[PDB]
Amino acid sequence: FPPGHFKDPKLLYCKNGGFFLRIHPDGRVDGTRDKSDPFIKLQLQAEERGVVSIKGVCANRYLAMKEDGRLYAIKNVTDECFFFERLEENNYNTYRSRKYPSWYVALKRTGQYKLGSKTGPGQKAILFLPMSAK
Numbered sequence: 001f002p003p004g005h006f007k008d009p010k011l012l013y014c015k016n017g018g019f020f021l022r023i024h025p026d027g028r029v030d031g032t033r034d035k036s037d038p039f040i041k042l043q044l045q046a047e048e049r050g051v052v053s054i055k056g057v058c059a060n061r062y063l064a065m066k067e068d069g070r071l072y073a074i075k076n077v078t079d080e081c082f083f084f085e086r087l088e089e090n091n092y093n094t095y096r097s098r099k100y101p102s103w104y105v106a107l108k109r110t111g112q113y114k115l116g117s118k119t120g121p122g123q124k125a126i127l128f129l130p131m132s133a134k
Contacts, residue, residue: 017109023056069116
C-alpha cells in the first residue's frame with residue numbers, strides 16, 4: 001500500500017477535567033477518564049492546511065458541530081466535520097469549526113460537551129492535547 005494508507009490513531013485529552021474525547025457508536029460525543037475505553041481512539045486526518053477531521057475509529061463516525069452548537073458524530077463526512085487545528089501557548093491544541101468559525105470543540109468539567117455558542121478562545125474547555133494511543 002502507498003504511504004499514508006494506514007492512519008495512526010491518537011487520543012485527545014481535554015484539559016478541563018482531564019477527559020479523553022469519546023465518540024460512541026450511536027453518535028453521542030462526551031469524555032471519559034478510562035484510557036482503555038475503545039471509543040476514545042481517534043483518527044486526526046489532515047484535510048486542507050491547518051484543518052483536520054476527527055474520526056472515532058471504533059464508532060466509525062466523524063465528529064461534527066451542528067448549526068445549533070451541538071456536538072455529535074455522523075457516519076458520512078459533511079462540511080460540519082472540518083476543524084481548524086491551532087497550537088496553543090500551553091502546548092495544547094484547539095479545534096475550531098470551519099463552518100461556524102467562532103465555535104470550538106469543547107468539554108465541560110463534567111465530561112459532557114459544551115455547546116459551541118458558549119465556547120470562546122480563553123476557556124479551559126477548548127484545550128485538547130493529542131496523545132499516543134499506544
